[PDB]
Ligand binder design. Structure first.
Ligand SMILES: [Mg+2]
Ligand SMILES: [Mg+2]
Ligand SMILES: [Mg+2]
Length: 179
RNA sequence: CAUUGGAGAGUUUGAUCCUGGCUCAGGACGAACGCUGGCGGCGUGCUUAACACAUGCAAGUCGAACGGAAAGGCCC
């Protein structure tokens, strides 16, 4: 539909009571637009559909923009929440999302189409997802880098990156008109 | 004054997170084995006993260095 989502992982958690165990289901969802806004939602329920829906509606209110320099990451980053380290590097067009399941789902929902992502540290899906999330949040878009440094993009950033951004904008124009 | 390049999964708990080993998906081979087997092209083929070897062959050539004449060859 309008917003593209992947179910990263589901788990069957339980609570022990005098009678026995009270099982429950946890859901990781990643919901994105495919063009730069993406979020992750955690859902608790007694049932898989309810947990998934709760996670999705909780993720809707956690959409953060991701800077894409033409279908790829702006610059290499390394994120880490708790113990989930995720390394991201931009890749040439056509490389694809070379990433592990959870991080790959996060990137595909964010709309990145050429990226190299490695999962260092723990392999727990939730923590790896948070590490991919803050790795993406660490991304620093070239115009705001120029604002930070009090300079211009032509003075701070690589000419190849800027050029590739122009050609990507031109294919954007193409699609738009074509429509 | 950009890059040609990096994927995980299972398993400790009632459940969780971490640590952590174990196991697996890939590629490879001077390989062997099992089942099966049409052809062609190009390679490769004792990794162990530097263990012991029947048989044939694998280093000869020169008469324009020499005496020669055992064969073939010409002349009697
Ligand atoms: Mg650490
Ligand atoms: Mg224990
Ligand atoms: Mg168990």
């Amino acid at each position: 539909n309008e917003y593209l989502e992947r179910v990263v992982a589901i788990n069957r958690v339980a609570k022990v009571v005098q009678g026995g165990r009270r099982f429950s289901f946890t859901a990781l969802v990643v919901v994105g637009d495919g063009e730069g806004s993406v979020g992750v939602g955690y859902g608790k329920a007694k049932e898989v559909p309810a947990a998934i829906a709760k996670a999705v509606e909780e993720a809707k209110k956690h959409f953060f923009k991701v800077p894409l320099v033409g279908r790829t990451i702006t610059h290499p980053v390394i994120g880490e929440k708790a113990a989930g380290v995720v390394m991201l590097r931009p890749a040439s067009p056509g490389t694809g999302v070379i990433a592990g399941g959870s991080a790959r789902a996060v990137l595909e929902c964010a709309g990145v189409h050429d990226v190299l992502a490695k999962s260092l540290g723990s392999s727990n899906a939730i923590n790896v997802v948070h590490a991919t999330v803050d790795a993406l949040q660490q991304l620093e878009e070239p115009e705001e880098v120029a604002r930070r440094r009090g300079k211009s993009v032509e003075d701070i950033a690589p000419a190849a990156m800027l050029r590739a951004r122009k050609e990507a904008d031109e294919a954007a124009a193409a699609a738009r008109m074509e429509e």
